[PDB]
Amino acid sequence: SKEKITVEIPAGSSISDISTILEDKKVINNASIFSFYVKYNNDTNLKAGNYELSPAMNTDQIVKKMQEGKTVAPAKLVIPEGYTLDQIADRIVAYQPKLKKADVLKTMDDPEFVASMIKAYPETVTNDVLNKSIKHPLEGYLYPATYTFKGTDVSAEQIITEMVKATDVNIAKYRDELTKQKMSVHKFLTMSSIIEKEATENVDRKMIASVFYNRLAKDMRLQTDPTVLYALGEHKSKTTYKDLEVDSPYNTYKNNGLPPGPISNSGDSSMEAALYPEKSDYLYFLANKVYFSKTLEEHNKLKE
Amino acid sequence: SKEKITVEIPAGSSISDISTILEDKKVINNASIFSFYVKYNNDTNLKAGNYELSPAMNTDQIVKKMQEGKTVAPAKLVIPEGYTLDQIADRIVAYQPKLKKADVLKTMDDPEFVASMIKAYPETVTNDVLNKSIKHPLEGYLYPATYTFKGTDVSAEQIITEMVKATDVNIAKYRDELTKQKMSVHKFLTMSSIIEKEATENVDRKMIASVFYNRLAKDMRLQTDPTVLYALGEHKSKTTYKDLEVDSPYNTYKNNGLPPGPISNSGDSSMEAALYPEKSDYLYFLANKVYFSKTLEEHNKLKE
Amino acid sequence: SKEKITVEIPAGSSISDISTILEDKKVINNASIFSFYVKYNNDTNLKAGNYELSPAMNTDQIVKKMQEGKTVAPAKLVIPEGYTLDQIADRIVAYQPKLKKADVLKTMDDPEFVASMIKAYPETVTNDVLNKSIKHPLEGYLYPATYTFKGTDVSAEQIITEMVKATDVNIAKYRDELTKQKMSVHKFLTMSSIIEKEATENVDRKMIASVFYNRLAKDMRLQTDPTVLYALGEHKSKTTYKDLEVDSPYNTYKNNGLPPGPISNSGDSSMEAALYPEKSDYLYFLANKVYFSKTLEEHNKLKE
Amino acid sequence: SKEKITVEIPAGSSISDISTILEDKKVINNASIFSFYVKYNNDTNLKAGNYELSPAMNTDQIVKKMQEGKTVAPAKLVIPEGYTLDQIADRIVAYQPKLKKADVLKTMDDPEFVASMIKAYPETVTNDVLNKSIKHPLEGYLYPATYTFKGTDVSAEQIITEMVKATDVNIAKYRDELTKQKMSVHKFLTMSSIIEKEATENVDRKMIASVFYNRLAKDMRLQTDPTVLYALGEHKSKTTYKDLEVDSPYNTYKNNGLPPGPISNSGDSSMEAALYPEKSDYLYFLANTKTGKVYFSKTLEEHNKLK
Amino acid sequence: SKEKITVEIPAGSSISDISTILEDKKVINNASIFSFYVKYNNDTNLKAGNYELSPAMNTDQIVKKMQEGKTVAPAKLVIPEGYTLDQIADRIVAYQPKLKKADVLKTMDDPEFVASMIKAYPETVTNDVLNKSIKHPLEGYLYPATYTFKGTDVSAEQIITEMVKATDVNIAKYRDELTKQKMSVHKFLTMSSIIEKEATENVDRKMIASVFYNRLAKDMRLQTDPTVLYALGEHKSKTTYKDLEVDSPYNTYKNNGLPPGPISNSGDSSMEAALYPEKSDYLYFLANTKTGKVYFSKTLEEHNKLK
Amino acid sequence: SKEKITVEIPAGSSISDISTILEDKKVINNASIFSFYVKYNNDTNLKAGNYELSPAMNTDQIVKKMQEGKTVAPAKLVIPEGYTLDQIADRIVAYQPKLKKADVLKTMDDPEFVASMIKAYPETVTNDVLNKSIKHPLEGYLYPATYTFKGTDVSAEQIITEMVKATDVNIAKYRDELTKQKMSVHKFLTMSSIIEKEATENVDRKMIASVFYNRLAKDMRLQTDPTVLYALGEHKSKTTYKDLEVDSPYNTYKNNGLPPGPISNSGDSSMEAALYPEKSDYLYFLANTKTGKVYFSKTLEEHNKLK
Ligand SMILES: [Cl-]
Ligand SMILES: [Cl-]
Ligand SMILES: [Cl-]
Numbered sequence A, B, C: 001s002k003e004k005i006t007v008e009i010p011a012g013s014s015i016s017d018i019s020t021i022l023e024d025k026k027v028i029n030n031a032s033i034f035s036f037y038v039k040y041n042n043d044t045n046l047k048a049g050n051y052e053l054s055p056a057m058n059t060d061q062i063v064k065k066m067q068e069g070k071t072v073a074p075a076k077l078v079i080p081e082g083y084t085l086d087q088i089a090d091r092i093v094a095y096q097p098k099l100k101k102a103d104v105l106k107t108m109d110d111p112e113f114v115a116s117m118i119k120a121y122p123e124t125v126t127n128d129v130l131n132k133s134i135k136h137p138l139e140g141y142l143y144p145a146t147y148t149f150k151g152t153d154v155s156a157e158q159i160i161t162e163m164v165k166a167t168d169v170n171i172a173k174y175r176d177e178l179t180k181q182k183m184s185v186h187k188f189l190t191m192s193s194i195i196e197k198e199a200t201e202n203v204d205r206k207m208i209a210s211v212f213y214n215r216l217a218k219d220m221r222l223q224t225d226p227t228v229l230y231a232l233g234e235h236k237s238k239t240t241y242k243d244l245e246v247d248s249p250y251n252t253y254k255n256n257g258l259p260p261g262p263i264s265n266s267g268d269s270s271m272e273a274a275l276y277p278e279k280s281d282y283l284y285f286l287a288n289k290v291y292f293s294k295t296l297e298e299h300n301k302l303k304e
Numbered sequence D, E, F: 001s002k003e004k005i006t007v008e009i010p011a012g013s014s015i016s017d018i019s020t021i022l023e024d025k026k027v028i029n030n031a032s033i034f035s036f037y038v039k040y041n042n043d044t045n046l047k048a049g050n051y052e053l054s055p056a057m058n059t060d061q062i063v064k065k066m067q068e069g070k071t072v073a074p075a076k077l078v079i080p081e082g083y084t085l086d087q088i089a090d091r092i093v094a095y096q097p098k099l100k101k102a103d104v105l106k107t108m109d110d111p112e113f114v115a116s117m118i119k120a121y122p123e124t125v126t127n128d129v130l131n132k133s134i135k136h137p138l139e140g141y142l143y144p145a146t147y148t149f150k151g152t153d154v155s156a157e158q159i160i161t162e163m164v165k166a167t168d169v170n171i172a173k174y175r176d177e178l179t180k181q182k183m184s185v186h187k188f189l190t191m192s193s194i195i196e197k198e199a200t201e202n203v204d205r206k207m208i209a210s211v212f213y214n215r216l217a218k219d220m221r222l223q224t225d226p227t228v229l230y231a232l233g234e235h236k237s238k239t240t241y242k243d244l245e246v247d248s249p250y251n252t253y254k255n256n257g258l259p260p261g262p263i264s265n266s267g268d269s270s271m272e273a274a275l276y277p278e279k280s281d282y283l284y285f286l287a288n289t290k291t292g293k294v295y296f297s298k299t300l301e302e303h304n305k306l307k
């Protein structure tokens, strides 16, 4: 009654994770033993979410409540900012384990599914996503936020649709300014993503933005590493010299202008940054504390 | 529904084997714990075969499905080529564990059971198997292949009968050529078995056959080791000099001609080899790469 | 049906013992795990006896069959020869665990129970057992043999009564010879017990008997160690010099003649020995091979 | 030769907590079996912190590192913006483990140590820091940067001195403007700090600064939460109502003007804002408790409306 | 003194997989208890391969051999027929563990190493191996036999040289026939190889050879699967339809003639077949996907009928 | 300082078997936990035999003794009555472990060793032992007693010699009677042995002896089971019907007279019986398969009636 304890099970939680949350919250006495019960009975299909449980509630009543998903708040699909479709796919299958990563990736790039989004969100997803130079059409169109779903075994299509919708809803406030600058949504999101992937912790994004706009204006290549990493389709730390020679239109070391599309989704500061850049004469920047230099010399003479 | 996983349990699988296949296939989380469940409840009578299972299927529902043998494909009794009745008996009891090896061996050599085969497969099993010099009448008559059975607790007689039948069915294609060369089935199978036991991996069986026919024709003893090993009734690696003195009609070091019967069952290449030997003047061969020498000298001068 | 396995559980078997017999006989796969099941469910009241069990019989069906005592042959109370009432009491409580040793010992020496035996078996248990010099009246009257009982929670009185009855039944054959030599049952059993406790493995009991009769006849004390050990009420190996001074009528080092009664029950050879001693002039003997010497000197000069 | 996984064990973590983090991070295979090891051997004295572990690392070694507390020692001493002396003390202890937190705090506030700084950097640290109402004299005077030391048992005094020197060196460019506006280094760093703690990453700090100056010129209290939190010497995110009543000169809800000194150190961004604010009519500001987008409103009603 | 059981741990085997193989092979008694040992001690870095273990061998030793990967080192280097340079590279590494697979492959294809062979064995390895269209110049030139080396850190070059020398020595008997038919050693070894990969043990290779020659004389492509598999540098059993479309001069479904070079080494049986085929009218052949009995049919219809 | 418990591990004991005997004997507390230790460490090579263990003895030591087979070594070599050479061989090996059973048996039957005994003890071991029909020449000639040896690696020959010497010394008292009855030492020891194996402890051996002599004088076969069992070289309790048909001169069901030699050694009791039997008309005897009380009946019917 008033002896209730509210536990929170994040999406993608292992059996040990669940067991340990239950012990931390005093619902059960020993995490190992609960893990043993689960594996012994093969009750591994536990649903994430928030549950109202009580101490000395029989182990089977607990497990059964979790297998039936009788929650007080649903499981949370958290999609962070700076994520590629591939990374988002990892989260989706960790959240809805009956889905397989290869199928989710197939749906995201499916011509018929992509066309449905173009039709359903015409002012956000346009024919621009169909450029043959783009690797994955919806890259950058799945918005960073937490999502929940009421259905059972929800499809990858339903899940992805909500992430496109959130993008449509959340950039509505930027729409008049996009029209004022005659900037397509696609380019807006492209610029935001390159700003997103370079932006450190507390670094000023509006300055980073100004460096990229300044370079576009003077016909200098953006020479931004996260685009090369994206072309090679990998989420690694550094980029070697051999990587700088990757033959891809996303390679901003060998191609002038913005890449064919975004390389990830973006946060609001990166979006504000793209639309309202700072006015400066900076053409270079180095990350870690971020030093903006305005000449060829100052930058090269600012190593170590 | 579409969440089904097909698992395959080979005949003779231990509890650990079963447990591990279940973990490999993602039906259960932990092999040790399933092993523990089985032994704790004493549910050790699990039937081999193929099952349609799903993840998070309760452990008892899994075990119960395996105890009742509710399979999508039956258990497979695999009898390899080059096997003696004794080895086949090992497989039979591993496949149908309510049978005891001593009883299976008794049935194989039972006068009344042997006579029934002579009557049921008259063109394959003839009075030749009744020669008092033969150790085990049906040696070589149980064909190498995979067998399945629908009945419950099938008798050793039913099982053995099918292996005799398969021999009858599969040598039907060689029957006209046997008549053409006036070669009894018994001798055909005898020759095939000695070819089978000498044949290495990729060695040419038709040459080995020609050496044995050449020796028969010149009244030389076959001097083939697997026959001595057979006489001593053991499945060992080497044959010592004291073994070469075993007093048995199967001993081709002390008796001229083919032994009284086969020393094992044979594959199709060994059978083709027996009926269609190569024409050559080779009288010796040494195994490991197989070198055929055509004179007394060349062989002795080809050691190490 | 024909898959039955007969297991034998001796009286006094621990849980490990039971578990191990079940594994040895192939009824279960693992003794430890069965032990775990028993202790986990607290099903420790398993009845000894012989059971018809089968492999893959569910653990609970096995335990339940043993808790209900549904045996094919009852539990065996084995009483060996050369046992004191105290040792017999150990066996009784190990066989019928609801009884307590202190109560069983109380019943054995109870005046009213002793009198009932005198009344029920008048030609075997007589007033001689009431001599105030006797430590335990029925000492030696409980016969060595295996006993079984059909009742539930049988009383110590019922159990002891059967051991007195067996003595009455089994010495019936010696009765005419006892009358011929005018030897009371009490003395007969007393002599048998001292012969029983000295008798080694293959030593001749009729010679030992003759030494004790020879000593009685010449008024020499029997000087037999097991009587001193009995007086001190202990089942130990050796007897120190301080033990030889125990002030008890059972002490045959300080009292002439037979002790007041038996110091244990006896086997048939010891009984035959008491009634039909050998004729000799031996007055001493030393145990280990047993050397009988006929003079004071020969014995003392036969150490080490 | 081996791959290194950094794991973090939070303070107050139970044995199950630790086991499960190891399994999550793929250093061990099974959290239960690890819990059993710890209990069986009775190795329950496991220290919280950051460790560099390897998968397949023998269980004994893992446990032995946590028992002894052989945690990740940073190659360099990094001091970020918006940090108080207490937090700097942590980064210092983490970097030079032979030093104890209590001593480093004492050195910071040691009258003789503070007097030596007033003597060594007279243009930067002046008698202003000795004002009776200041909690910690050098609060705000240890510059945010990356420092390294050649020495072996580097003392807290040596380290702190390098941070005070960095401040002195790095504000040299603002000297001319400070002299022109007649703003003391102390009031300068005070504004900078209240600006620093109120700005999310991308916020326009020059507007935040203008609000404060506007309030200051209009005799309106600054009412900035970070100053309340600093008053309580507490590193939390939100302030309660009871906190707003705290008796302290640092409480800008109860006192007009700037607090007696800075509440943290500041980045160049904030320093520029302090000296070069924007000329505007804004007197209120609110950052979304979601996006971190700062909205400046001219009047009290406009501000309240944003709930 | 002790009995030795060889166990095989396949690549990608889980801990349960390993435990159960040990129990199956009777090296340990209980797979569960072994899994627990591995997890408790955190000895999860167990290398795949072949090991010589003994029953009753202390658990620590077992695990220690697998961790260190102290696998069965063959006394001799055996190279069977039908092997490609990649497979020879494995047998070499297994035999001389100090050598790495990547280097052995590089040596095989090293322009300077190949030129040295053309110089050392001029009657056997000629400029033919330097044809632009060949994947690996020495493919087919390393003879199948058993080799042994007295040396200590025998180099890949020494080893490969002995195999090339064996080829040179062992084809000496075919020289006279090659000269008479004017068949280069290179085309000789090419035929031999396509014959080798198409014959089950007992099949009549001289008929297989006649089919190929017949097709060759009739301008019919050889359409032999093994050449397609070799084109993909893949050691599988069956070829899919997508594989038959692979763009490569080695693809005998898309190009007439023999491939640019051999696809493996060959046994004497195949070599005889190449030089002494049977005179016949067969143009197709099919081996049972069951018995391995090869059926030669004269026409296209007769062939198709065997499904 | 410590209490010692002797435990016995029978041949073919499983790990559970061993664990449970240890628990029964109170050397360990819990059979399960011990089984787990054995399996976890993979110490499954536990030798059968008799061990002196102590309670609280560290588990590792217990297991280590059984692995190495460091069993209870008797201080002295005791040879009881009714023992055959095979059984004596066991007592010898148990006492002097460096010796192997197969060698001790060979020495016993070694022609040169036997000839040396015929030479060293000519009054006792004569050419009679070399009779073609005897299984083991010295069967019955190794006296039952307790022996001890000062030597270090005492040989089987030295040991056997002492037992043959004991026989020679200890039958000296019967010499005069043997000469008077003209009974060879060999027939003497033969009777003694068949008398020995047929007597329970307290049975009157002089009556058993009279039966045999009576049968012998009446040309009735002795039909004594122990001779049949000895014929089969088997140490069992009961003889089956198939055993009674065994082809051997030792089989007294198929041959008249005494067997070719003794079937074991004998105690003085049996020896006296052989030389001084009782004069009686008994021709049959039966010992209860319960009490071991021997009943002698004069005729065939009286005997059969006792079923
Ligand atoms: Cl607990
Ligand atoms: Cl697990
Ligand atoms: Cl087991």
Ligand SMILES: [Cl-]
Pocket: none
């Ligand atoms: Cl349980």
Ligand SMILES: [Cl-]
Pocket: none
């Ligand atoms: Cl349960």
Ligand SMILES: [Cl-]
Pocket: B030, D029, D030
């Ligand atoms: Cl696990």
Ligand SMILES: [Cl-]
Pocket: C030, E029, E030
């Ligand atoms: Cl086991």
Ligand SMILES: [Cl-]
Pocket: none
């Ligand atoms: Cl442990």
Ligand SMILES: [Cl-]
Pocket: none
């Ligand atoms: Cl341990």
Ligand SMILES: [Cl-]
Pocket: F029, F030
């Ligand atoms: Cl316990």
